[PDB]
Write a protein that binds this DNA or RNA. Structure first.
Length: 206
DNA sequence: GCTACTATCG
DNA sequence: CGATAGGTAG
């Protein structure tokens, strides 16, 4: 793990110079995923973050945990179904999201969601095909779940708006790059594209 | 002080 | 189409 990061960092330092320079300035990767979280939880967290900064997302989850739980633990599927969308909406979840998070909890209850062990065996493509069946869960949301919950190392969220902005100046492009362009420009980062994206994400912090 | 900053549905 | 979640950097 922290060993994967050593290897990852060395690899990004063996590509072209700009990558080597970014690693040195930003320093050690501090990305901390949470694979212990059950599928329905990581998915709800990813859904919540849609269109929202980490800070906003976190204040919303903080409330969700404080209200819909006792020991400020992440609400269980049953606790989630026992809450109405109006109440969920008061936590900061959009009305649409409140409905989707509701379906997700119900699905976890009825074992309609792939189990963790089964998710652990799915390639990203299979994972994409599987979870995309869930309302409110698509490419962006599934990459975020793969990165922050699952801890996969070769995930390049080329479709992330912020990453594209950071990619634009990192690669000195004339205009914000399309998704496919970010895809091939970061090809050399394999098999640690997650770490590559993390580093591009730290650029504002400089 | 003010604003800009995913995926779905009538 | 065109609303829609909110903390906070600029």
């Amino acid at each position: 793990k922290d060993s994967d990061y050593k290897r990852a960092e060395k690899h990004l330092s063996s590509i072209d110079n700009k990558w080597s320079s970014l690693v040195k300035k930003v320093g050690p990767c501090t990305l901390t995923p949470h694979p212990e979280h059950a599928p329905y939880e990581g998915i709800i967290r990813a859904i919540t973050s849609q269109k929202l900064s980490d800070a906003a997302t976190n204040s919303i989850i903080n409330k969700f945990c404080t209200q819909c739980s006792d020991n400020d633990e992440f609400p269980t599927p049953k606790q989630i179904m026992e809450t109405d969308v109006e109440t969920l909406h008061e936590c900061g979840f959009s009305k649409l999201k409140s409905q989707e998070i509701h379906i997700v909890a119900e699905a976890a209850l009825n074992k309609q969601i792939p189990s963790k062990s089964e998710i652990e065996k799915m390639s990203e493509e299979e994972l994409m095909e599987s979870l995309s069946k869930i309302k409110g869960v698509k490419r962006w949301t599934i990459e975020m779940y793969s990165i922050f919950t699952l801890g996969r190392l070769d995930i390049m969220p080329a479709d992330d708006s912020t990453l594209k902005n950071e990619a634009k100046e990192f690669f000195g492009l004339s205009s914000k790059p399309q998704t496919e362009e970010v895809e091939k420009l970061t090809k050399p980062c394999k098999p640690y594209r997650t770490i590559a994206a993390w580093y591009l994400w730290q650029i504002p912090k400089l």
